[model samples]
Target chain A: RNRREEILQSLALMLESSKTRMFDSLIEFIEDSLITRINLILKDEKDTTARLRLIVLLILGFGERNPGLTRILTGHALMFEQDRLQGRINQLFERIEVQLRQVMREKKMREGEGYTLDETLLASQLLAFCEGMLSRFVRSEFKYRPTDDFEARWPLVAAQLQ
Target chain B: RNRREEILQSLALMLESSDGSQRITTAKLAASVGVSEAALYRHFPSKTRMFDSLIEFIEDSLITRINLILKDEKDTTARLRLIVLLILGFGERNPGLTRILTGHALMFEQDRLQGRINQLFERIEVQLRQVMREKKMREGEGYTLDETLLASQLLAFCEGMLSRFVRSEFKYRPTDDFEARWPLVAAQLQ
Candidate 1:
């Protein structure tokens, strides 16, 4: 992958993993390392689709892992959407899913060889988690159960299959 | 109408309706929750004890959740993130609770409430120290970062954010895009 693609891929993977993993510390690590990179991309990208993709990924990534943060991004996204940034709004979810798939593929590849993808998977899961979280937040909804419990259940479900 | 239940209900209701200019009072709480002010004393020995119960609830709830998250997850950094998020998110949902938890609500009238609130944060700081120890154990390296100091900073940030959110009439959500900013904050500590 080229440098730009590498950044995108790394971010996607980070988002996906952050969602799936239970490690809060590692999630914080990835967030600190990659958020600036993602922000830079969003700032510099000229293509509307690409910009929207990055924004959505960032929003989703932020939301899944931190409810408080999700509320902030959802507010921003809603405001942007109301200002007629509809393309950006739709692209947010679209890119979030696309990035999530890419991250998951990498996780399976890592797992197939018996390597621990805990770190990588943590990032991806966080991204997907943020996407769903932001959707509810934008709509002004609340989940009675804690988000940590909700995120933790995914691995338990996978463990049952194994 | 037990004293313990009455106080708890009052505390919860106070937190629920604590928007600026519209405050709940002890009398109003008693009437609204279907109890009398004097009935509040039946379950608790005194009004002070009633407030103490709320403080105890905050401490127990916080410690229990923090310990559970720390135990279930091995990474220290993750533990810290969730802990901060939990604190801030709770404030977001319950602004009144935030005021009481942070002691801002108790600042004017109640000295004991303030003291208890201070103790609550002190206990939280101690928990953060234990978490930092676990982080060192897992990484096999000590962080020069002081857990107490870091804990204070984290708590201060969350409180600051919560206060602003409430002051703004819940127009602002404290935890929004927290993940995006976590990296910057984490980098400073680590």
Candidate 2:
């Protein structure tokens, strides 16, 4: 396989591994290639179905480690009414959330760590920010902002471990 | 006084009172300006035209100031900063005009008010494109931003700031930390 295909395969493996207490690794991968790939696809892709598939893959990878991502995916399903591609993307988001939550609950039971429902709540807030930003952008034809306080707030969540 | 000046003064008076403790009305405006309803009609055929004249005032005044800044300021970044500051400053001084600029004024007279405000935004987009062109020429950065996109984003940010400011009843200034934030916004544009 070529270098790009190898990277893609490793990404898929990393996403699968992310369900089991491997959040740090998942975040690192996201910061590296996944975000870059998603940004690139968003910038370059004109084909609707291909873009939707790419978005699904990006959301799936995100949902594996973070409940926030799952909620965001569900939101995209509900709020947007673009086409079949978007609908399927929304379905994939829902599917990923159900699967990830079950895995997280099992992991919590095994590790004796209490499961916090705050993940879902935080996800909803972040999703609100994303949807608002995207709606503003799409309405204005991709002229609006994509980032809010997402990065600033991420550190606060991270500080919980310290 | 000429008909246009009288009409403009009446609109300004109306806006001023609208900002103050009093709610505005055609009767109050006619009484304040000492003009009969017929006299006011000689100046402006419809209430909507009077509203359009105010919009024209905002558009013309803002563009004139923006042009002055562009001519005097060499740096594109500083020009952009000043433009945003100018908008916020205008809002601070004219609370009623702030409502009009931010679309809040449209709620009362939805169709006419909203359409004119949207056009004001399109003018801002043109101004942003001019600034972007100047920046590319001076810095040789080849920064090709979608003018409408940048304009829309800036408008959203400004609207968000204005909404928060009004919600807090003019206590919060939208220009707060504007200098610090412009660099971050500029970075995103690049």
**DockQ class, candidate 2:** incorrect
lDDT of candidate 2 over B1-190, digit per residue (tens):
3866776656655553433222345666666678887777777776667777778778887888888988889897788778877877777776666656644344445355666666676677678767867777899885565554555455555554554454334655777666644554555454
The CA lDDT at A38 in model 1 is 60
lDDT of 1 at B48: 60
Q: Write model 1 residue lDDT over B11-32, tens digit each, in one string.
A: 6656545321233455765665
TM-score of each: 0.49, 0.50
Which pairs in model 2 have colliding backbones? A143-B149
RMSD of each: 15.3, 16.3
CA error at residue B103 for candidate 2, angstroms: 1.7
Clashing residue pair totals per candidate (backbone < 3 A): 37, 1
Give lDDT tens digits, candidate 1, residues A1-162: 134334433453344322323123333333443445565764586443344345435544444545443333332212211222222333343444464344344434544542233433333334333433343332223342224333332332232111
Accuracy of chain B in candidate 2 (TM-score): 0.78
